[PDB]
């Protein structure tokens, strides 16, 4: 109605990787002008599963920012393209931010969606305030057992031919092949019937995804290439204590390797205290995991997101002076000294708040 | 078309009004490179990506243009020397903070002090013997 | 020979820092006790130490913040870093 607004479109198969438009759900915040957050769900996962998380009055996330539950290419409602390059998918978000008139946004992700969110900060750091990654890390996960199961489920899902198979044939095939209960439920909800009861099909492009996973090479979604580079902004990582995707022993090192400003464990990298359970990857289903993720997310958005690198928190905005490098300013008659870095309005490009406040400033003087 | 639509749009690619006054990093990062870090190759990608944005990925403009050093690092060795003279213990404290987070045992710390002061004591006895040879 | 893969949980240097420090200083003392004219070697090394460092300072370090950058060696790193990526994506490009 008002808070939940998902723009309706039809996926278009595109030959050019630049003519790709992303669709998703928009969640309006409680207050008038708030920065926006763009969040990516796990690969082949519904955006609607995160709606109760982002609209929970106890967590009160919308009090901080507007949330875009956006689908990547070949997923859900967005356009389809055979390439899964993280740079090409990152440029999709920039065209989405432009068409939606968003100057800069916070990026979030779950699982593989965490890699996608962090990749956008790697390729467009000036348009991204921060990255909040849930149960993911910028590392090659092609050989993790959790990814192999997901890779195996997508491969088995290519066997089903929707024209010949009946509905009862599909239900039996999924229960027997997909043993994970959550992956089974997610894949069933991705099945949808086209207009005029033409046939059934998965919402995500099963052909393009299977070739990406089955090939198991550098462009796979499980892999993180060196080509992606380094993210220079604020990054926060949260994952379960016993997670099949992020192992606390060594899978934290990629975060320091890719993110330049990560301080370490206990500051930007936390683990949710929990038991061994293969379903603990889906933090929004369990209140214990969801409460900790939401509190850490509120702390990131409130005090650490979109703050200059050399400032500690948002509390230092306007009272902490950063040293300046010599011969860095165009003015020749400039006395070099410490300064407080400029923080800009979240959508200053598409509004005239700086022009309006200039005129109000002249009325004072 | 939408891709070229936003590349031409002035609102999308436009410096802020105060951008001229701000401190500007006048290097792409090729002047001082991190050689032994595990993310060394990822650093080079960002340098290459920064050089490409400056020339719209027409690197012939960079080849013909002027190349400049990192002028922000000028006289940096002098400035650290004067800060050490100003407050030597405060300079040494913060420059060694992260290293001192791992503290060795009392034995190792005692051996450091014991062998250091012992070497200084023998140095003083060698100086006093040189005055004996001069006499 | 083959790559000397260590099967251990920690590297050899960090596990034997105290021991390697002993043998490190043993050979320093060994050379120090053996070299009775060590002061003659220190003085004989002063002139070349000053000369070669002042002569090659700009070409090694001074160029990074003074007159010319001399980015020839960086261009060789940047090209090789791009080839490293092309080889990593060989299967994709050929497919």
């Amino acid at each position: 109605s008002r808070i939940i607004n998902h723009l309706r479109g039809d996926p278009v198969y595109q030959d050019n990787t630049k003519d790709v438009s992303l669709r998703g759900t928009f969640l309006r915040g409680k207050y008038d002008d708030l920065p926006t957050m763009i969040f990516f769900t796990e690969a082949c996962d519904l955006t609607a599963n995160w709606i109760p998380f982002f609209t929970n009055p106890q967590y009160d996330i919308l009090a901080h920012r507007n949330v875009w539950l956006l689908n990547p290419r070949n997923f859900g409602n967005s356009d389809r393209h055979p390439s899964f390059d993280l740079q090409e998918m990152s440029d999709d978000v920039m065209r989405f931010m432009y068409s939606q008139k968003i100057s800069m946004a916070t990026l979030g992700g779950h699982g593989i969606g965490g890699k996608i969110a962090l990749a956008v900060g790697c390729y467009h750091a000036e348009r991204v305030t921060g990255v909040f990654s849930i149960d993911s890390s910028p590392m090659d996960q092609r050989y993790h057992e959790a990814f192999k199961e997901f890779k195996g489920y997508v491969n088995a899902l290519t066997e089903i031919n929707f024209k010949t198979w009946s509905d009862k044939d599909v239900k039996v095939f999924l229960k027997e092949n997909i043993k994970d209960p959550k992956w089974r439920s997610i894949f069933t909800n991705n099945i949808s019937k086209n207009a005029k009861t033409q046939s059934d099909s998965f919402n995500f492009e099963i052909n393009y995804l299977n070739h990406n996973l089955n090939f198991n090479k550098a462009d796979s979604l499980g892999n993180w290439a060196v080509k992606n580079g380094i993210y220079t902004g604020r990054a926060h990582f949260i994952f379960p204590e016993y997670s099949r995707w992020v192992h606390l022993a060594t899978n934290t090192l990629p975060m320091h390797k890719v993110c330049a400003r990560v301080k370490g464990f206990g500051h930007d990298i936390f683990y949710v205290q929990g038991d061994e359970n293969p379903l603990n990857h889906w933090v929004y289903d369990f209140e214990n995991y969801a409460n900790v993720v939401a509190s850490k997310l509120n702390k990131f958005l409130h005090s650490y997101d979109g703050v200059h690198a050399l400032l500690k928190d948002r509390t230092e905005i306007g009272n902490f002076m950063i040293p300046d490098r010599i011969k860095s300013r165009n003015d020749s008659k400039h006395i070099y000294g410490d300064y407080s870095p400029a923080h800009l309005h979240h959508n200053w490009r598409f509004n005239h708040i700086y022009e309006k406040h200039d005129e109000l400033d002249k009325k004072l003087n | 078309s939408l891709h070229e639509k936003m590349q031409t749009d002035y609102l999308w690619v436009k410096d802020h009004s105060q951008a001229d006054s701000w401190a500007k990093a006048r290097t792409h990062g090729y002047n001082y490179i991190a050689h032994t870090v595990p993310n060394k190759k990822e650093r080079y990608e960002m340098i290459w990506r920064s050089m490409g944005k400056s020339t719209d990925w027409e690197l012939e403009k960079f080849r013909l243009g002027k190349k400049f050093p990192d002028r922000g690092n000028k006289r940096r060795w002098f400035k650290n020397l004067f800060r050490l003279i100003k407050n030597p213990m405060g300079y040494i404290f913060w420059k060694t903070y992260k290293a001192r987070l791992a503290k060795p045992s009392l034995i190792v710390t005692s051996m450091f002090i014991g062998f250091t002061l012992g070497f200084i004591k023998l140095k003083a006895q060698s100086i006093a013997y040189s005055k004996k040879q001069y006499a | 020979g083959p790559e000397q893969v260590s099967p251990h949980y920690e590297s050899f240097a960090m596990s034997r820092k105290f021991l390697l420090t002993f043998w490190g200083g043993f050979f320093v003392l060994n050379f120090g006790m053996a070299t009775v004219d060590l002061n003659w070697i220190m003085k004989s090394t002063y002139i070349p130490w000053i000369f070669w460092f002042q002569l090659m300072y700009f070409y090694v370090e001074g160029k990074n913040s003074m007159f010319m950058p001399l980015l020839q060696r960086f261009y060789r790193r940047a090209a090789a870093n791009e080839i490293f990526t092309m080889e990593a994506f060989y299967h994709e490009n050929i497919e």
Binding site: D85, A218, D219, K227 | G52, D56, W57, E58, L59, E60, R63 | E82, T85, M86, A88, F89, E92, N93, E95
Partner: peptide, 17 residues
């Protein structure tokens, strides 16, 4: 996959390629 991003990759002083 990966493509050369430098548009002047095949430029020489005598012409293209």
């Amino acid at each position: 996959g990966y493509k050369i991003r430098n548009k002047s990759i095949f430029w020489t002083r005598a012409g293209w390629k």
